[PDB]
Amino acid sequence: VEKVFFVTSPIYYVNAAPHIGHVYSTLITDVIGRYHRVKGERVFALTGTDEHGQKVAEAAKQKQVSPYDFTTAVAGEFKKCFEQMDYSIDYFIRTTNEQHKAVVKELWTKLEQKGDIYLGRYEGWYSISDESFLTPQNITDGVDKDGNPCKVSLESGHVVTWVSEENYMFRLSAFRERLLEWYHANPGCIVPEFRRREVIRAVEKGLPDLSVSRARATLHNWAIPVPGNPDHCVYVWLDALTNYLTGSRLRVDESGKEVSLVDDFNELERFPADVHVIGKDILKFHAIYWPAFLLSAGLPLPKKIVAHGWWTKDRKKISKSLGNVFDPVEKAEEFGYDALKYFLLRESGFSDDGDYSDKNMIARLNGELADTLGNLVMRCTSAKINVNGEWPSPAAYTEEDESLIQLIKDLPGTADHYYLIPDIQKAIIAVFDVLRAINAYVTDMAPWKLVKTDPERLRTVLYITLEGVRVTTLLLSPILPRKSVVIFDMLGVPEVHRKGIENFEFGAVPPGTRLGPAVEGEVLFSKRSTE
Numbered sequence: 001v002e003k004v005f006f007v008t009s010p011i012y013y014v015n016a017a018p019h020i021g022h023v024y025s026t027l028i029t030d031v032i033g034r035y036h037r038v039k040g041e042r043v044f045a046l047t048g049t050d051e052h053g054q055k056v057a058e059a060a061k062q063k064q065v066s067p068y069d070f071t072t073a074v075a076g077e078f079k080k081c082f083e084q085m086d087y088s089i090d091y092f093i094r095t096t097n098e099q100h101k102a103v104v105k106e107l108w109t110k111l112e113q114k115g116d117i118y119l120g121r122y123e124g125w126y127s128i129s130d131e132s133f134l135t136p137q138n139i140t141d142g143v144d145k146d147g148n149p150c151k152v153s154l155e156s157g158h159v160v161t162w163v164s165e166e167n168y169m170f171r172l173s174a175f176r177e178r179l180l181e182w183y184h185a186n187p188g189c190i191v192p193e194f195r196r197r198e199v200i201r202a203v204e205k206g207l208p209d210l211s212v213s214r215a216r217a218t219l220h221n222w223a224i225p226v227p228g229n230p231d232h233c234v235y236v237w238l239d240a241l242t243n244y245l246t247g248s249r250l251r252v253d254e255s256g257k258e259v260s261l262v263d264d265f266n267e268l269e270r271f272p273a274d275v276h277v278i279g280k281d282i283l284k285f286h287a288i289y290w291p292a293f294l295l296s297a298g299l300p301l302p303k304k305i306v307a308h309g310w311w312t313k314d315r316k317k318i319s320k321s322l323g324n325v326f327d328p329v330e331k332a333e334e335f336g337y338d339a340l341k342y343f344l345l346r347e348s349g350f351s352d353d354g355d356y357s358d359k360n361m362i363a364r365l366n367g368e369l370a371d372t373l374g375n376l377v378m379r380c381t382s383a384k385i386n387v388n389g390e391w392p393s394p395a396a397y398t399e400e401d402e403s404l405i406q407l408i409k410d411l412p413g414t415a416d417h418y419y420l421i422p423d424i425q426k427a428i429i430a431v432f433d434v435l436r437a438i439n440a441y442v443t444d445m446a447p448w449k450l451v452k453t454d455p456e457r458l459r460t461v462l463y464i465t466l467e468g469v470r471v472t473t474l475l476l477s478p479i480l481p482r483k484s485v486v487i488f489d490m491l492g493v494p495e496v497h498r499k500g501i502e503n504f505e506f507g508a509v510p511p512g513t514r515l516g517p518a519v520e521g522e523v524l525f526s527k528r529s530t531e
């Protein structure tokens with residue numbers, strides 16, 4: 001089926017300023033969206049802010065401000081950050097949006113009409129910081145900000161608190177068998193595989209019913225009212241998850257403002273998500289609660305949930321109070337936006353908690369972006385080697401020539417597979433493996449010497465080198481969007497060949513194509529010293 005490729009990020013709590021974690025998650029969403037756009041697909045990428053709940057209301061109280069003003073201010077900060085980070089997100093959703101509120105009420109009514117919501121009680125532990133219900137097996141002893149003994153979440157280390165409330169309960173226990181069918185029938189639906197195995201293990205053990213409302217006072221009346229019961233508010237998580245559905249139903253003008261909410265999601269062809277990008281910390285809400293809500297409501301389920309890991313800087317926790325900060329905008333100005341994005345995406349895969357350091361960052365910038373890629377682009381466009389500033393016409397290919405051509409021809413199918421898992425690190429490694437091959441070929445062929453010795457040979461070497469560099473760059477373009485444009489300009493690749501599966505094929509740019517003009521002092525990636 002042909003539809004809009006729908007990729008999302010989590011909507012982030014606005015209790016504090018945006019930091020690296022939100023940027024990282026949103027980057028992954030951006031990259032996937034971008035790759036499907038260069039395949040020539042329709043895309044809708046979604047990100048946003050999670051603005052209701054006790055957590056946010058209480059953060060607003062701490063700063064001595066009204067929830068409306070606090071959420072608007074912090075949401076403003078997320079937008080500014082994401083704009084500065086230079087993503088290509090199609091819409092930024094806020095759970096305070098009035099159309100979102102309408103969608104939450106529609107979904108609730110469906111759950112109720114289906115018979116999957118009843119009035120009951122939650123008596124148990126709750127982590128406000130995580131907005132998460134927890135069993136006694138999931139808490140332990142710890143310390144609050146006073147130094148006193150308290151209970152904390154095993155998941156997250158945050159303070160937990162005992163709740164005893166009459167709440168509307170969702171019949172999650174009734175969806176065990178159906179969720180297990182779903183996992184088994186779609187063994188790629190959760191990524192990476194070991195997180196998929198965790199989810200099944202958890203659901204195998206059995207599911208309790210889930211509280212989907214809270215008494216209004218507990219939430220400082222900062223939440224969406226339960227339809228038909230003004231004393232209750234909708235669980236912030238049921239509210240939050242619903243953003244994906246809301247997003248799928250919004251018509252958005254060229255300014256990026258929501259202008260209309262459609263009744264039937266099919267009308268816009270986005271729902272359900274092809275990929276939900278999340279962090280490991282919020283796996284249960286997306287891989288258990290969400291599909292259960294959807295199954296109850298008769299809505300289609302998402303194709304993939306991909307959950308990545310947490311970050312560190314110099315093998316330590318990131319916090320201002322702890323004295324270990326990683327500001328993404330600061331680091332992008334110091335090293336470059338595309339370079340920083342490359343590093344975040346190259347340095348760690350989802351199974352790992354990665355490690356930034358200025359040292360390792362400089363090693364990758366110098367090693368991979370400058371020595372491997374940048375080097376290659378300058379060689380194949382150099383006045384010295386490419387003396388006519390054009391894509392030459394190749395002569396006959398040797399076996400060594402053909403081995404390289406083969407690697408290049410195979411590259412898109414391989415990189416495509418990795419992007420679809422999705423596993424962005426593996427795609428980058430695949431493209432750079434081919435780049436390393438091209439460098440070894442060039443070294444082997446010594447085109448600087450061929451300029452004088454054998455110009456007919458130089459034509460073949462140069463043509464393959466240019467074509468390798470174009471194809472690698474096209475595949476790296478979701479990761480280095482600005483630099484890929486520079487590279488293409490230097491190579492003189494026409495606009496039409498910069499996008500589309502058609503241009504994944506070897507030889508899509510004809511010989512005789514002129515290179516772009518050169519600048520006396522220009523470099524794609526400039527090396528950094530080692531102090």
Ligand code: MET
Nearest residue numbers: 010011012013050240241
């Ligand atoms: C529906 S995604 C909600 C994610 C949550 N607001 C967080 O920041 O962890």
